[PDB]
RNA sequence: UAAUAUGUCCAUUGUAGAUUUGUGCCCCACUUUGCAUACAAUACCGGUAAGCAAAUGCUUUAUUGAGUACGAGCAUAUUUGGUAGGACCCGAGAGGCUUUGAACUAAGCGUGAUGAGAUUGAAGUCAGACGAAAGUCUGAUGGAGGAUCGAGUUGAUACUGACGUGCAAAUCGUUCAUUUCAAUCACGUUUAGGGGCGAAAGACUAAUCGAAAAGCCUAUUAGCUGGUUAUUUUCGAAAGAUCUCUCAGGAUCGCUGGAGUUGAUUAAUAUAAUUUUACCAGGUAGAGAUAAUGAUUAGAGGACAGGGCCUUGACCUAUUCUCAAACUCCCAAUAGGUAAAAAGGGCGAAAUAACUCAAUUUGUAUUUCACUCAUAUUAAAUAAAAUAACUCCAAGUGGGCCAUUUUUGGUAAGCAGAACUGGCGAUGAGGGAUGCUCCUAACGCUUGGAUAAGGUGCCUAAAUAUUCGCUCAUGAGAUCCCAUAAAAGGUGUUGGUUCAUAUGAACUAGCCCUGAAAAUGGAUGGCGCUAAAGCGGA
RNA sequence: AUCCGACUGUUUAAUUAAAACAUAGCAUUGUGAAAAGCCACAACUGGUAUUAACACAAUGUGAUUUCUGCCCAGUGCUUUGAAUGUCAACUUGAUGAAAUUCAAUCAAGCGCAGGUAAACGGCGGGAGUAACUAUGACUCUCUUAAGGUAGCCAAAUGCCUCGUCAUCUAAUUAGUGACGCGCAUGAAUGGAUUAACGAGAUUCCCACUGUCCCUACUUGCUAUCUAGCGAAACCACAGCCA
RNA sequence: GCAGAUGUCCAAAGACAAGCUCAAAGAGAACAGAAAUCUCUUGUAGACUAAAAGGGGAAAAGCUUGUUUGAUUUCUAUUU
RNA sequence: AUAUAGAGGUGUCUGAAAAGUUACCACAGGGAUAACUGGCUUGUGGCUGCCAAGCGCUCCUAGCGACGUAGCUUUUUGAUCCUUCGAUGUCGGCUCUUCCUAUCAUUGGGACGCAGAAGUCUCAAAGUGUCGGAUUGUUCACCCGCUAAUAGGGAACGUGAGCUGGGUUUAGACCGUCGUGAGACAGGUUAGUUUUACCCUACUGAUGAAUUUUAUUAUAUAUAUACAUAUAGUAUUGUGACAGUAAUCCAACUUGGUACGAGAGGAUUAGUUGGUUCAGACAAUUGGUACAGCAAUUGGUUGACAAACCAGUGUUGCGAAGCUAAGUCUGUUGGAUAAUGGCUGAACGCCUCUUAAGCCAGAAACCAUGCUGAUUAAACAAUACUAUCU
RNA sequence: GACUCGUUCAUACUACAGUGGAUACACCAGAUCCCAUCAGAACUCUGAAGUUAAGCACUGUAAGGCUUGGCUAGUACUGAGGUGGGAGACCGCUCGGGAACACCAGGUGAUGAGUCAG
């Protein structure tokens, strides 16, 4: 079925993806990434808090989805279920392989750095500590060391809160849907 | 067929080049000569092209030869090497050739012998009994049988008994199978080695058998194993590579030694695992995905298809999340190449040519003259740079392994496979308790000194040094490789950070505790150590 | 009671005594003779053979009982040959100045046409289908030289497997009796069955016992000590551990 | 180790020249439809180039046409 | 025939013209290379965590625990090929000892989805124990039964100069499949030599010298003295450092049909009597044993009777004594603790088992006591006499 | 002012606009001949009636692109060193070297030879 995970923890060998020289790789655990009010404008949530892994790791697909199925749950547990965003922002993509000799693609690896980010969720600044806590539920799944970390974001867009705020105040910037674009002054009339 | 070719006894032309000759006794800066040799260039000889072609073959053109251009060889002594031989020594299994064996054993034959004693009781025979008939029974006798049991004999079933440096290179004990027949034994005799003999086990053929023994061919051959003999000194490797019926080998390169030569000895030019100043060449690390390929998660904003103006879609547009060893708009570090001037370069003349051009001189290149280029700081440094080149002759080696870093396969491996460098191997010494590779440092023999790595409680030479913290452990901790520990905890203590109203939080990181279980007894190396002799410093 | 061999016999001298070999019986094949068969020998000659088809030689199977199915495409063996493709020397002819080069020819062999399995051997797969379901007499289909027949079986032949049901036991991966789409049974590779026999292989029952519970005592001979005599293998040096 | 490919194919798919521009998309035109042909617009190649894959290629190295055999003989310097 | 240039081909592609088998094998070698251990690794197996979506009537966590994730172990099988091919005897059983703990039972505890009983989870605990059988060569497995329980392992997958040799893995042979065949089988079946200790060490016992750079826990008449005592030889009695250790579990009944429970059921703890296993003895008694000894008797032999003898101890019967089990007897309790429960009591004005300082009760565990040795201490003391002693 | 041959080969491109045509370019007019096709569309030839409408030149666009520079950022990465840390994964320090995307701002050409018109 599957091996204990810690073969399957350091980055070994180099980037092996799928394509046309691995054809058969069964499909990735995680299939949905982002859930909870997707749909929702970039005024409606203002906190933000990362799950920031300060490990060089592979992370499992299956461990993964696990552990965004437990930040959902929480979530669902704790207040609404369209008061809240979870991204996943990390892809596996690293297809490893088993030997039973070069060995055959078995699975998916979410390939981490030091400074990126795994789970973020976009909530409302009133269910921040919710959010933190299931971002640590998460991580108790998730292997190697990870940090809740807030942001100072208004969420998943780059800039920071109070900074926002003073856009939104001008008007320099217009709101799409969970993306926000920032007026450059640049393009023709 | 056979090496300028009779203009001249002269000895082809250069560029560096020893020695000379002079000028101002080694360097200098010129002249002067130009050994050896290197590098070319020409001639010419043989062949072969090509062009011509009846000659003694001719040619302004090619190529090729182990050629030639004023000979160097021959002989011999020693040497190493390579080859043949017994071939450094010792070692096979075998192959053949000619003999010797059947006293053992195998079978056949000839002549002889040998099998205590019992048991069963076949035919035939005799007597008796019954039946309308056919016929059928009963008691003897008889002594048949590859019948039965069984001493001996011949064997060898079991104890897998004893013995197993025995009594014995197959024995002993008990048990067992065999005993009138395909029996057993003796003597004689026949059959002999790729042969015999075989109720067949490749059995046996003199303790020898899936081809005897003896001698010879033979000191057969072995890329394989073991061995391979005085001392000191000097130099000193490789375990790459290409080809190999090759992967335990060999051949040739590499690396090494010796021999020699040309040089250098003019703190120079040559040159250098080095750097600079120039100039390049890259596409790895990184970075990118609203740059292309391939992926890839979302919604937002928009204008073809389906259902009853709305919904589901797809499609554009602007975005967004994450990516690539076999993606790239870009692009490091490191590594690499050329450059940095006298056998040369400048600007010029005159030459020469069958080349080139439209230009007998348009240029090219060559040659001879000119003028003139830093130079003792030596055309940027620095250089125990000539200990250099080069030539020869050879040896060993061609199983490698390890460490940091980069790295591929592999769950991983003291695993397999690579890259750069260093090691070990070939290497000791001081340290790492102990150790082929870790650190220090490579080694003549001595004295004194001062260190390196590491240490300084004792073992153990050197501090129970000083100085500021941190740790208490009912399985502490103790220094690269290294001899393991993790996720997760901890109202243990010690600092912090962020917050709130001297408390309440949340965190955070040090030490410490839990997590933490394997087999002989037990290992920071031991003893021990807690105001450390622990951990982190100074 | 089961398995194997029928039996008496023989065998690997010194690890295998048997289920191996032999055996009678059965079956096959060749050969009518010194020009035959099978074999030996360098040769000439010889053996079988002082033989003659109830013989000799060569095989296979292995008493009896009961049977030995199908298949000659494959490989063998074998039978007919101027119809016959090929197939050698010689021969013969053509060519040439000749060497040669070419053609042609009734050899066997093979090819062509048969015969042969007690010669070597081999001997199917899928579907569908019967008043509660199952199974499939029956049907279709691809294909083979023939598609394994009578039998027999988890047999010394069964991977799965310690196969399912019985039976034996308190319990049985054993034994026995069944079952059988049998990886991969099977008919002189003989199949199936067998009385008697076997230092054969296997299981159970009764008797019997120190095999064992659970050891004890005892006897000879050794060991032991002495007198006498007196080796060897082995041995780098040696000999405590964590 | 990984993803593959080769033992060939071609009088042209060779040679030279000329002309032309391809894939795709859109908007159009009887039959005509998701593919038939034609036209225009846009078209850095997203086509095609004998085949593996990677280069390279646009008044071409692709496509169309014309003319042809240099897929010729001999010999060097050489690179891998 | 050459010369030159192509072509006919070597795909093992720098280019032999080439099929098998050996379980009948031989030789040279190879740990450059397998099957065995160990070693490295731990994928696999086994074991342990962490998180908590649920399950568990209600309830995340009594017990569980999906999705995930972190380890450890080498009792699995691999991966590996470092060690050994001038041999480390290759499975299993029997036998025997020790070690481990990842404890099945027993002791003490804590938790429960603990009313009692039974049980489940868990902690200190390895002291003591963990069987008889049927089938299989088996390890493993599966039953049957007893049991307090029938826990898991290791020690060169402990243990072949200990054995056994059933299997695997020689030669014989049979069957099936495979191969044209010789033969092959990680298919089945049967028959198939298990050599040597007398060496060193280790262990078990058995003697036994020697021991002055060696000793001394005092001696001597309140004072002395290590600037000191000590001869030796026998012999008795002791000392006892140190080493070894031993006892174990159950049943029945009484407590009690009581506590508890609606009821059915139904105990802890003591106490008593027994037993099991083990150990140490011992033999009155029972049995066992016979080459003390009597008695009988068979065949033979001495002329007979008698007395005997011989038959590897002739064979019986009985058999003292001596050994011996299947027989009999005996097999302690303190200290200090672990788990745990507490106590006083801060940190932290309360609370707090101390997750401070101090205490307390507490286990089949530890150490004593007890028991065995004590040329394990080269030990020593005291007495007794003696050869000269001062 | 314009053209021809060019050089660098986007500051030169593209998209949408505007402005300009003395000479020039260009479009355009015609097909006998050389020629080329399905087609005088192209190509070729012969012209000069018109026109800047396009080509072309020039300019504009809080243009796309491209090109310089800052800024990312001394961040990422990295050469050498370390008995540095960290169980490891990896991460500091010492001597050095040093990016990219994005972002912001500037720029949108220059030029060699010749000829022609005034
Ligand atoms: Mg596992
Ligand atoms: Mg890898
Ligand atoms: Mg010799
Ligand atoms: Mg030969
Ligand atoms: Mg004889
Ligand atoms: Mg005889
Ligand atoms: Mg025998
Ligand atoms: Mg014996
Ligand atoms: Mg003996
Ligand atoms: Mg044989
Ligand atoms: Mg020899
Ligand atoms: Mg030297
Ligand atoms: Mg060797
Ligand atoms: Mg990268
Ligand atoms: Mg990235
Ligand atoms: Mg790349
Ligand atoms: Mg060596
Ligand atoms: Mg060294
Ligand atoms: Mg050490
Ligand atoms: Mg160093
Ligand atoms: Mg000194
Ligand atoms: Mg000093
Ligand atoms: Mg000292
Ligand atoms: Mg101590
Ligand atoms: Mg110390
Ligand atoms: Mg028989
Ligand atoms: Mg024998
Ligand atoms: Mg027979
Ligand atoms: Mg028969
Ligand atoms: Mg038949
Ligand atoms: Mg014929
Ligand atoms: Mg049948
Ligand atoms: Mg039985
Ligand atoms: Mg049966
Ligand atoms: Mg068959
Ligand atoms: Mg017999
Ligand atoms: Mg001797
Ligand atoms: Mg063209
Ligand atoms: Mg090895
Ligand atoms: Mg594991
Ligand atoms: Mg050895
Ligand atoms: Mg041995
Ligand atoms: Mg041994
Ligand atoms: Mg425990
Ligand atoms: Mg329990
Ligand atoms: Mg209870
Ligand atoms: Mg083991
Ligand atoms: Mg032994
Ligand atoms: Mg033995
Ligand atoms: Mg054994
Ligand atoms: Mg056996
Ligand atoms: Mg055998
Ligand atoms: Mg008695
Ligand atoms: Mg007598
Ligand atoms: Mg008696
Ligand atoms: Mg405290
Ligand atoms: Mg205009
Ligand atoms: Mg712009």
Redesign the pocket.
């Known amino acids: 079925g599957?091996?204990?995970?810690?073969?399957?923890?350091?980055?070994?060998?180099?980037?092996?993806?799928?394509?046309?020289?691995?054809r058969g790789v069964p499909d990735p655990?995680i299939?949905?990434?982002?859930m909870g009010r997707?749909?929702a404008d970039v005024n409606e949530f203002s906190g933000v808090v990362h799950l920031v892994s300060?490990?060089?790791?592979q992370?499992?697909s299956?461990?993964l989805?696990?552990?965004r199925?437990?930040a959902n749950?929480?979530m669902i547990?704790n207040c609404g279920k369209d008061n809240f965003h979870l991204?996943?922002?990390?892809?596996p993509?690293?297809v490893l392989?088993?030997?039973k000799?070069?060995?055959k693609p078995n699975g998916v690896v979410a390939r981490?750095?030091?400074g990126?980010?795994l789970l973020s969720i976009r909530t409302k600044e009133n269910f921040v500590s919710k959010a933190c806590e299931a971002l640590?539920?998460a991580?108790?799944?998730?292997?190697?060391?990870?940090?809740v970390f807030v942001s100072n974001k208004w969420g998943?867009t780059?800039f920071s809160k109070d900074e926002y705020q003073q856009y939104k105040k001008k008007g320099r910037i217009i709101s799409?849907?969970?993306?926000?674009?920032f007026?450059?002054?640049?393009?023709?009339?």
């Open positions: 599957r091996r204990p995970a810690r073969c399957y923890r350091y980055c070994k060998n180099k980037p092996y993806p799928k394509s046309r020289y691995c655990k299939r949905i990434y982002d997707k749909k300060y490990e060089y790791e992370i499992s299956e461990a989805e696990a552990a199925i437990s749950k929480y547990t991204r996943v922002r990390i892809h993509f690293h392989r088993i030997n000799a070069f060995g981490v750095d030091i990126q980010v640590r539920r991580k108790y799944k998730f292997p190697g060391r990870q940090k998943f780059p799409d849907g969970v993306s926000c674009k007026i450059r002054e640049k393009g023709p009339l």
